[PDB]
């Protein structure tokens, strides 16, 4: 809805703090981790898929964090 | 059947995350920003020499 | 200073995407789901023999 | 806020249609496709950063899809 595209990375910011600093700065980092602790199956299976395709450890960690991030 | 969707006000209050609040309830006063300035103090006496 | 943060009625009508609607208006009438039924048919007269 | 984690994968789905079938099935895709057409430089940058990691074409395509899809 309109509650997505939240007007973040488009400049215009100054010393004065925004409408939501310290509230809308960690809300995408809490609900991912809440989704991990409430849906572990895609975390283990995403770890197996990331560990499968990927030669170095950096690519396995990268695809793991990205597949963990794209899911809600 | 056709139903209305409801007040989108709180969704918009979470849509403005990263938007510097100004006020326009009396005037249109902004309280953010900057302006470059060339401070030219040629004829600036000391008042006490 | 403090401000309240609007109405999440429309902000939750987006959150309720994917949730199947029921009708709690006069009795909690649902219109969702299935019901497994074993049906035995050893006393059905045929009405026309 | 509450408009995130939008109650999608829970089981619980039947032959009846949900609250926002066909109004929420394609809003994510057109949301990121209207995001790319207003921020293309992240698509070029994510293309060249996904190209130089993952030395097979499928890992490059996967990291490009994921790095584009993370940014809302």
UniProtKB/Swiss-Prot annotation, chains A, D:
Signal peptide extent: none
How does this protein lie in the membrane? Multi-pass membrane protein
For side Cytoplasmic, which residue ranges?
55-60
Which ranges form a coiled coil? none
Identify the domain of life: Viruses
* Membrane-traversing stretches: 34-54, 61-72
Q: Where in the cell is it found?
A: Virion membrane; Host endoplasmic reticulum membrane
Q: Which organism is it from?
A: Dengue virus type 2 (strain Thailand/NGS-C/1944)
Q: What is this protein called?
A: Small envelope protein M
The record's function comment reads: May play a role in virus budding. Exerts cytotoxic effects by activating a mitochondrial apoptotic pathway through M ectodomain. May display a viroporin activity.
């Amino acid at each position: 809805s309109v509650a997505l595209v939240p007007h973040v990375g488009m400049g215009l910011e100054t010393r004065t703090e925004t409408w939501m600093s310290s509230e809308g700065a960690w809300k995408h980092a809490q609900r991912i981790e809440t989704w991990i602790l409430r849906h572990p199956g895609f975390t283990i299976m995403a770890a197996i898929l990331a560990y499968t395709i990927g030669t170095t450890h950096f690519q396995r960690a990268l695809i793991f964090i990205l597949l963990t991030a794209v899911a809600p | 059947d056709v139903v209305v969707l409801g007040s989108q006000e709180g969704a918009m209050h979470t849509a403005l995350t990263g938007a510097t609040e100004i006020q326009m309830s009396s005037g249109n006063l902004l309280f953010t920003g900057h302006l470059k300035c060339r401070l030219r103090m040629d004829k600036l006496q000391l008042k006490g020499m």
